[PDB]
Amino acid sequence: ATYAQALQSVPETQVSQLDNGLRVASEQSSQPTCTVGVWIDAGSRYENEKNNGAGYFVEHLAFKGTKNRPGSALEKEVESMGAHLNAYSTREHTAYYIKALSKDLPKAVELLADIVQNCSLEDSQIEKERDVILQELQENDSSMRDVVFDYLHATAFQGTPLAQSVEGPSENVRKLSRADLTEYVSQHYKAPRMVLAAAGGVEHRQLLDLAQKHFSSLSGTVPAFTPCRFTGSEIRHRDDALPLAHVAIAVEGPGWANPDNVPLQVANAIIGHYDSTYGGGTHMSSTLASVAATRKLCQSFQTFNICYAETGLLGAHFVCDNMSIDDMMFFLQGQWMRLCTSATESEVVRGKNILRNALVSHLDGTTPVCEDIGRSLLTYGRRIPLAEWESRIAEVDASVVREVCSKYFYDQCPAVAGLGPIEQLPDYNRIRSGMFWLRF
């Protein structure tokens, strides 16, 4: 088993398609557990200004009682057989997955059929949930990471649905009524926009039979989004009482398509990640992280690759004190243009290995495998096998990384979002000047 043989030995993801348009897919294994869930193409990207937050609201209400299962009775099932019911709604995806035993798949799918089709939307339950969402919004206000990322989205995609947050404004939260929720679920939770993923010890034919027996009476056989526009801007929520200063700087990246994602991830793998409670410290190959550990510039930093259907954000997010924002902006831009102008071969090899490890280790356990299945059948349109990922990483070299970074980084207007004691944060002109090198 020389790695490549191990990659070939990974079982494939069989994909089917119901008459209603449900893309039933499954990956068979030998584990005695399973994770089955539907991924829907709803989210804030498909939400208008007045509807903003309806997806989060309906996701909240989904588990709190159905039509056939009144209230906690549904929950009474999930705990009775040891299942873990969970959900998450991204800006472009929504999902409700139920961890269960391999022998509980016939029931679990049934529960899923109840959650997405025969929902309740009880008015009194809506009233109880409204204040809960308000308090959750207040809790997220203290989340200086999520707040900064929402600031980045708003200041990068201003004037487009992508700028909208997942939870939506509090005004919409209090305004939203049952009619809007049922209209939203009837318009977005359509069969062609749903994929019933199931990883673990589930046989694909059994999954197909269950889906045909439960998800049959869905929609027959329309929000298709609008191409959003990137607008290099900046938001400075100067608040000196905050202890640290979260900064996020991004550029218009690629989408789920546009294979340039694979080299680009490698570049991010070169920059890497670091925080105070790390290991080697002033020895890690990342020059950014090594310098940060040497001079203690920050408490954290990361490189994200948020990519949507047609566009996406590529950049970094660092958490540091008030007296070191300028230095880390300098070093981060220096690393970006070092990769842009002369990426070398050894760093590219290290990035390839890091990306290989990320993809391989991320896809362990039934939950990440099922999530990958559901997300890939929506974004890529196909569950990309790990062998294809290996080949695509292998094709990446120094010249490819330099070219792709030049395409996406060099002389590009970034979007900046700072929160906290960000007085040191250089003005947007200085950042944009850092986005190009005079020597080169």
Partner 1 sequence: REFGHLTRMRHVITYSLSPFEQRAFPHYFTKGIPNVLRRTRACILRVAPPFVVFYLVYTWGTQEFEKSKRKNPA
Ligand X SMILES: CCCCCCCCCCCCCCCCCC(=O)OC[C@H](COP(=O)([O-])OCC(O)COP(=O)([O-])OC[C@@H](COC(=O)CCCCCCCCCCCCCCCCC)OC(=O)CCCCCCCCCCCCCCCCC)OC(=O)CCCCCCCCCCCCCCCCC
Residues at the site binding partner 1, with contacts judged by CB under 8 A: 155, 231-241, 322-323, 325-326, 413, 423-424, 428-429, 432
| Whether the Cβ atoms of residue 235 and residue 249 lie closer than 8 Å to each other | no
For ligand 3PE, the closer of residues 339 and 354 by Cβ is 339
Task: Catalog residues that contact ligand X under the rule CB under 6 A.
Answer: 330, 433, 437-439
> How many other CB atoms are found less than 10 A from the CB of residue 178?
15
For ligand X, the closer of residues 11 and 439 by Cβ is 439
| Nearest by Cα to 271 from 217, 178, 209, 333 | 333
For the bound state, the minimum distance from the C-beta of residue 291 to ligand X, rounded and expressed in Å, comes to 14
Considering CB distances under 5 to 8 angstroms, the limit depending on partner class, which of ligand 3PE, partner 1, ligand X, none binds residue 344?
A: none
Counting beta carbons within 10 angstroms of the beta carbon of residue 86, is it exposed (0 to 12), middle (13 to 18) or buried (19 or more)?
A: middle
For the bound state, the minimum distance from the C-beta of residue 332 to ligand X, rounded and expressed in Å, comes to 11
For the bound state, the minimum distance from the C-beta of residue 321 to ligand X, rounded and expressed in Å, comes to 20
For ligand 3PE, the closer of residues 204 and 432 by Cβ is 432
Question: Cα(243)–Cα(320) distance, rounded to whole angstroms?
Answer: 9
For the bound state, the minimum distance from the C-beta of residue 298 to ligand X, rounded and expressed in Å, comes to 18
Which one of residues 21, 433, 439, 440 is an interface residue with ligand 3PE (CB under 6 A)? 433
How many chain residues interact with ligand 3PE (CB under 6 A)?
4
| Whether the Cβ atoms of residue 84 and residue 103 lie closer than 8 Å to each other | no
Lookup result for tokens 């490698």: 266
For the bound state, the minimum distance from the C-beta of residue 267 to ligand X, rounded and expressed in Å, comes to 19
| Nearest by Cα to 406 from 315, 341, 329 | 341
Query: Of these residues, 47, 59, 347, 390, which one is catalytic?
Result: 59
Considering CB distances under 5 to 8 angstroms, the limit depending on partner class, which of ligand X, ligand 3PE, partner 1, none binds residue 429?
A: partner 1
For ligand 3PE, the closer of residues 3 and 440 by Cβ is 440
For ligand X, the closer of residues 278 and 440 by Cβ is 440
Question: Cα(436)–Cα(322) distance, rounded to whole angstroms?
Answer: 25
Considering CB distances under 5 to 8 angstroms, the limit depending on partner class, which of partner 1, ligand 3PE, ligand X, none binds residue 413?
A: partner 1
**77 is known as an active-site residue:** no
For partner 1, the closer of residues 428 and 437 by Cβ is 428
Contacts with 154 (C-beta within 8 Å, 6 or more apart), sequence order: 163, 165, 235, 417
Which among 47-55, 192-200, 388-396, 432-440 is the span making contact with ligand 3PE, rule CB under 6 A?
432-440
DSSP state of 66: B
CA separation, residue 125 to residues 120, 177, 178, 231, 369 (Å): 9, 12, 10, 40, 34
Contacts with 253 (C-beta within 8 Å, 6 or more apart), sequence order: 261, 264, 305, 306, 307, 311, 312, 313, 314, 315, 408
| Nearest by Cα to 285 from 351, 222, 340, 234 | 351
DSSP labels, 101-117: EGGGHHHHHHHHHHHHT
Which one of residues 30, 224, 438, 439 is an interface residue with ligand 3PE (CB under 6 A)? 438
Quick check: 434 binds ligand 3PE (CB under 6 A)?
Answer: yes
- List the beta bridge partners of residue 299: none
Considering CB distances under 5 to 8 angstroms, the limit depending on partner class, which of partner 1, ligand X, ligand 3PE, none binds residue 254?
A: none
Quick check: 414 binds ligand 3PE (CB under 6 A)?
Answer: no
| Nearest by Cα to 104 from 78, 70, 73, 66 | 78
Considering CB distances under 5 to 8 angstroms, the limit depending on partner class, which of ligand 3PE, partner 1, ligand X, none binds residue 330?
A: ligand X
Which stretches does DSSP call E strand in 1-44? 13-15, 25-28, 33-40
Structure tokens at 160: 């487009």
For ligand 3PE, the closer of residues 88 and 436 by Cβ is 436
Considering CB distances under 5 to 8 angstroms, the limit depending on partner class, which of ligand 3PE, partner 1, ligand X, none binds residue 439?
A: ligand X
> How many other CB atoms are found less than 10 A from the CB of residue 198?
35
For partner 1, the closer of residues 37 and 414 by Cβ is 414
For the bound state, the minimum distance from the C-beta of residue 229 to ligand 3PE, rounded and expressed in Å, comes to 17
Quick check: 439 binds ligand 3PE (CB under 6 A)?
Answer: no
Note the residues at the interface with ligand 3PE (CB under 6 A): 433-434, 436, 438
> What amino acid positions are annotated as catalytic residues?
59
